Structures are given as structure tokens and as C-alpha cells.
């Protein structure tokens, strides 16, 4: 299994944007 991990570090690629966004 290695799909769950991709969700935890993809959500982070949107999190990054949450940075300077807020």
C-alpha cells in the first residue's frame, strides 16, 4: 500500500498554497 501516503503529501501541496493564501 502506498496510496494513503500520497493523500497525506498531496493535501500538503494544497496546504502550501494555504500558507501565503492566508
The secondary structure of 1-22, three-state, reads CCCHHHHHCCHHHHHHHHHHHC
What's the rounded Cα separation, in Å, for the pair 13 and 3?
Answer: 15
What's the rounded Cα separation, in Å, for the pair 13 and 21?
Answer: 13
Taking CA atoms, 18 is separated from 1, 2, 15, 21, in Å, by 28, 25, 5, 5
**Technique of determination:** NMR
Tell me the CA end-to-end span of the chain in Å, nearest whole number.
34
Cell of 4: 494513503
What's the rounded Cα separation, in Å, for the pair 7 and 20?
Answer: 21
Cell of 3: 496510496
What's the rounded Cα separation, in Å, for the pair 6 and 11?
Answer: 8
Cell of 17: 498554497
Amino acid at each position: 500500500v502506498e496510496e494513503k501516503s500520497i493523500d497525506l503529501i498531496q493535501k500538503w501541496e494544497e496546504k502550501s498554497r494555504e500558507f501565503i493564501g492566508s
